[PDB]
């Protein structure tokens, strides 16, 4: 065999402890670069001028953060959507001041995660499985793209991408509410139904299967020892599971087809999360949540407030305070 | 940073005590006649 043929055989081998694959060839170096830069920046990066106003924000542990407050901070508003690799900087000091790590991290991460999704297709093909696990992963992948790429594009700056940190994520969420009234957007509402529903059906399915395990163990043993990896027979009684759930609601509300059941478990959170991602990705172009501010008016013309108007008051607080030194003109237009 | 002077011991014992409990249990399971 050729040197190239042996290598292709190794790359695509079903017997590597971790599958490599052609997507893997791009995924591995890009994820490693993103990870290494993330960890060093989260520990040791100096403050970053995120809003391009020479007001640098400290994200790293060594510069006074803890796990909760720390972040890799987004690149400068002065940069906008300009591509800012290390070699476009005069020095590493400049690159650090201006939030260069954030760009390096997000772009390698998004490439490496896109290749993760391809890799899931690829291994399924090598193993003779059906191909759509990668389709379920496209839901969280699309959401990462929404916050790190599509939102910045729409708003004209990576300074508005989600920060890589826990408190920074909350900052992103609060400003987003103020600027898009995302709570009042039906795609975010579908997102919530997707993740609350996902959690509800997760608990439901787990409890129903666990409820109907076939007795294979004594009282002093974990029931988990009643199942052996790779056994042919099913380990629970789906008829008993269905008999319980059908009576809990009514017979027709219950699945006794395990394939339909497992399809539903996939589809509900995946579709809801696609809609969450499309919420962020379309609020990116400022088509925003429902606005019922002063929608209700009395016979004279007095505004009669509703809960929408109370939401609006909270949003105003967020709006007027955020980036308190950045706006010189009366409208925040991006 | 003027952090709480008990935060270090609290974190350390938080980690150590339950981790040691699990390690004790795991090793004595391994040493059981297989």
């Amino acid at each position: 065999a050729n040197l190239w043929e042996r290598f292709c055989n190794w790359v695509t081998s079903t017997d590597n402890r971790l599958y490599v694959g052609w997507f893997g060839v791009i995924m591995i170096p890009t994820l490693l670069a993103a990870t290494i830069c993330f960890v060093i920046a989260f520990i040791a990066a100096p403050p970053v001028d995120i809003d391009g106003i020479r007001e640098p924000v400290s994200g790293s542990l060594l510069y006074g953060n803890n796990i909760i407050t720390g972040a890799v901070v987004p690149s400068s508003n002065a940069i906008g959507l300009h591509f800012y690799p290390i070699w476009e900087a005069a020095s590493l000091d400049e690159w650090l001041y201006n939030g260069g790590p954030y760009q390096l991290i997000i772009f390698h991460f998004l490439l490496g995660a896109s290749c993760y999704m391809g890799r899931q297709w690829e291994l399924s093909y090598r193993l003779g499985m059906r191909p759509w696990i990668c389709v379920a992963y496209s839901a969280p992948l699309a959401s990462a793209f929404a916050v790190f790429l599509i939102y910045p594009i729409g708003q004209g700056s990576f300074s508005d991408g989600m920060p890589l940190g826990i408190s920074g994520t909350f900052n992103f969420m609060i400003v987003f509410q103020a600027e898009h009234n995302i709570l009042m957007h039906p795609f975010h509402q579908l997102g919530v139904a997707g993740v609350f529903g996902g959690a509800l059906f997760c608990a439901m399915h787990g409890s129903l299967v666990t409820s109907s395990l076939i007795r294979e163990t004594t009282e002093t043993e974990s029931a988990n020892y009643g199942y052996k990896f790779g056994q042919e027979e099913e380990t629970y009684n789906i008829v008993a599971a269905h008999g319980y759930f059908g009576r809990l609601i009514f017979q027709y509300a219950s699945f006794n087809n395990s394939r339909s059941l497992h399809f539903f478990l996939a589809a509900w959170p995946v579709v809801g999360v696609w809609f969450a991602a499309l919420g962020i990705s379309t609020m990116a172009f400022n088509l925003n949540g429902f606005n019922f501010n002063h929608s209700v008016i009395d016979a004279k013309g007095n505004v009669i407030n509703t809960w929408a108007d109370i939401i609006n008051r909270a949003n105003l607080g967020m709006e007027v305070m955020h980036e308190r030194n950045a706006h010189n003109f009366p409208l925040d237009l991006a | 940073m003027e952090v709480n002077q008990l935060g270090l011991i609290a974190t350390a014992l938080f980690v150590l005590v339950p981790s040691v409990f699990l390690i004790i249990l795991y090793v004595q399971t391994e040493s059981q006649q297989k």
Binding site: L18, N66, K228, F229 | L8, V15
Partner: peptide
């Protein structure tokens, strides 16, 4: 001291990932 603590815990977690993947209890069909 806080930074050391946070990095230590993090480092231990990465160590755990390594042992959990490469020194796992191997799945065996019986």
């Amino acid at each position: 001291m806080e930074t050391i603590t946070y990095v230590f815990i993090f480092a231990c977690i990465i160590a755990l990932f390594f042992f959990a993947i490469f020194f796992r209890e191997p799945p065996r069909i019986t």
